[PDB]
């Protein structure tokens, strides 16, 4: 599905917070909040070169 892996509003924290620069989920009190988001290496992310 073309939506898969991209139904998220994540953004990168940037350098300076002792964490890598992959985008991350916002908010709090959820468990998903703060996770790696879009990248192909990220759990729940989008696969490299989605099959068309």
């Amino acid at each position: 599905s073309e939506k898969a892996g991209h139904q998220t509003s994540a953004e990168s924290w940037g350098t300076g917070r002792a964490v890598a620069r992959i985008p991350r989920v916002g908010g709090g009190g959820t468990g998903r909040s703060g996770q790696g988001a879009f990248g192909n290496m990220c759990r729940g992310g989008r696969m490299f070169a989605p099959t068309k």
Partner: peptide, 17 residues
Amino acid sequence: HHPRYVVLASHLGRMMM
């Protein structure tokens, strides 16, 4: 769950120049 934030900020000053 436990949110996290920018722990301290500031208090580092500036160096050399």
